[PDB]
């Protein structure tokens, strides 16, 4: 986030998700999984809207719907059941929060509230 801000000031351009994604994966790969960061990286930039996941060993993947963590299987069950192409904003919030709820109820590692 710090290096992306300096890059944005240097280039006089709004930062890109692929930049944050590339910088994260090269850092995590360097530390061979010893930095246990499992991230879902999303954002809008001049290129458009992007959704990525990045695992601790520095592997990235692209999707329309992703889930990570202990409740990923509970969440992915809901996403695999209710996801379609061309979702509206209201539908995507509903699907996202429902997938978290699946994790909250059915996973002991997940609980409390839903942040969006």
């Amino acid at each position: 986030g710090s290096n992306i801000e300096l890059h944005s000031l240097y280039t006089s351009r709004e930062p890109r998700v692929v930049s944050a994604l590339q910088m994260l994966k090269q850092h995590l790969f360097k530390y061979q999984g010893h930095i246990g960061a499992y991230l879902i990286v999303a954002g809008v930039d001049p290129t458009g809207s992007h959704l990525f996941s990045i695992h601790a060993h520095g592997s990235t993947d692209v999707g329309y719907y992703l889930s990570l963590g202990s409740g990923s299987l509970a969440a992915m069950a809901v996403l695999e059941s209710h996801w379609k192409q061309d979702l509206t904003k209201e539908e995507a919030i509903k699907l996202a929060s429902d997938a978290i709820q699946a994790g909250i109820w059915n996973d002991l590692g997940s609980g409390s509230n839903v942040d969006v």
Binding site: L68, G69, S70, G71, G109, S110
Partner: peptide, 5 residues
Amino acid sequence: XFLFX
């Protein structure tokens, strides 16, 4: 310990 979703 550490804090660990």
